[PDB]
Amino acid sequence: MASLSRFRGCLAGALLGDCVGSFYEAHDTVDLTSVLRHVQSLEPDPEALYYTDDTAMARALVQSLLAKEAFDEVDMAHRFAQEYKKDPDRGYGAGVVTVFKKLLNPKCRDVFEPARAQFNGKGSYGNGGAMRVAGISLAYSSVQDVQKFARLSAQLTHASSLGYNGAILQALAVHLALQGESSSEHFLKQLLGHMEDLEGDAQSVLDARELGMEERPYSSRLKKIGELLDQASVTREEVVSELGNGIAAFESVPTAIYCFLRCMEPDPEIPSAFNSLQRTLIYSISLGGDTDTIATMAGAIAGAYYGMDQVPESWQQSCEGYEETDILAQSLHRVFQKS
Numbered sequence: 001m002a003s004l005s006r007f008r009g010c011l012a013g014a015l016l017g018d019c020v021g022s023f024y025e026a027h028d029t030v031d032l033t034s035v036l037r038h039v040q041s042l043e044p045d046p047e048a049l050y051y052t053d054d055t056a057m058a059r060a061l062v063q064s065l066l067a068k069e070a071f072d073e074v075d076m077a078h079r080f081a082q083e084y085k086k087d088p089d090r091g092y093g094a095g096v097v098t099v100f101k102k103l104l105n106p107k108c109r110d111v112f113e114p115a116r117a118q119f120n121g122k123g124s125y126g127n128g129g130a131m132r133v134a135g136i137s138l139a140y141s142s143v144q145d146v147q148k149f150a151r152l153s154a155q156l157t158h159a160s161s162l163g164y165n166g167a168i169l170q171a172l173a174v175h176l177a178l179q180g181e182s183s184s185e186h187f188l189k190q191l192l193g194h195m196e197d198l199e200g201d202a203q204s205v206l207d208a209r210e211l212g213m214e215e216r217p218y219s220s221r222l223k224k225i226g227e228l229l230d231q232a233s234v235t236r237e238e239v240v241s242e243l244g245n246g247i248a249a250f251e252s253v254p255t256a257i258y259c260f261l262r263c264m265e266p267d268p269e270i271p272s273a274f275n276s277l278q279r280t281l282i283y284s285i286s287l288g289g290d291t292d293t294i295a296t297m298a299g300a301i302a303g304a305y306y307g308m309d310q311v312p313e314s315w316q317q318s319c320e321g322y323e324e325t326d327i328l329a330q331s332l333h334r335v336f337q338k339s
């Protein structure tokens, strides 16, 4: 499979995760049968599903990378802010809105200061850095640039290492996804090596200990994925208890990744006519909690790995702006991949 296909699959899967997972975000628990009914209603026979903050930001991040042919924090920050100002009602978290509103100040002149000031200088560790980061791994091909620019992109709104390290991790998973066919063993191992190295930094260790998490929390969770995957049958309750399904990056980014890995194999609960990308998005949503973001992150990874061949037209064409999202992928491929 060729890499425009992976680029297109990445962004479309992210878009599907948002658009479809967003239906379940206010739900207590999620009924699997209801998710199955809903995705089946996308097919037939004989109204778009709206995207939210997660795709709005992912797009504005891509657009910045395209306009500058590189990461440029002043441009990206301004695009984030203007996209909010244009369409403020996409469903942004309250915390991120305070940052945008500071960014829209004429007297703001350090774009990283607003984010840094949040939670009394601790910064946010929510998943909003990670929800939008996929573009970084489509623009930057070296693992080093991916880490660097995923951190700085996240830092525009999420100044906590617990936040930006999750963005890094999600950027690395999509990066490794772009290399295609792997064992889940090999895939996790590579992710672990990177996060064990990142979480040894003194800032990451202070931030974890201050939160009272004792440290290397992304590394700890990547090891738990390891044991979940090698357990015969693991229930949703057990996944959510070990990994999380919440808004914090550490409760969502690893979960998105177990969903990707687990769903590489069939599941008798999910009709066997659904392909692996499909299964991933269904399974991701069925865990509840922060369904729009977990599924958009899991869709990003799945899409990069499986490509547009597993993105059905009926699903894709149900989503608001699926046409702009294909253009975004084609432009990124041309601007960054073709050379």
Ligand SMILES: [Mg+2]
Binding pocket: 022, 052, 053, 054, 091, 292, 293
């Ligand atoms: Mg959302």
Ligand SMILES: [Mg+2]
Binding pocket: 290, 291, 292, 293
């Ligand atoms: Mg969300």
